[PDB]
């Protein structure tokens, strides 16, 4: 089951894609790129998760953070905010 008290993924992720959508609303290239990174990273994460460990994920935490870091220059706010999402361990 899911929760309802103190929603982190909801408010955070939603406001994330929202702010970025309204920010680079004129640049669909960089926006599509980022989305493509998380997309491929998602599928690689799911598959690798179902595999166990004998699988070799294509994109890792460093792959995404790097490409994303290259996607933007003067806009580091996105990189930091994104880091907040990056699973802590």
């Amino acid at each position: 089951s899911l929760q309802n008290n103190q929603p982190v993924e909801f408010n955070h992720a939603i406001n994330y894609v929202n702010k970025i959508k309204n920010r680079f609303q004129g640049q669909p290239d960089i926006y599509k790129a980022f989305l493509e990174i998380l997309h491929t990273y998602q599928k690689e994460q799911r598959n690798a998760k179902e595999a166990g460990g004998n699988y070799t994920p294509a994109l890792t935490e460093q792959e995404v953070y790097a490409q994303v870091a290259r996607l933007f220059k003067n806009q580091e706010d996105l990189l930091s905010e994104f880091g907040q999402f990056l699973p802590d361990a």
């Binding site: 993924e9 955070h12 939603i14 894609v17």
Partner: peptide, 23 residues
Amino acid sequence: DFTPMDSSAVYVLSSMARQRRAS
């Protein structure tokens, strides 16, 4: 009011968030 990626963006985002400090 709001329109997501209409794909699975909410999933990957929810993954990084939930997995944070988890496991």
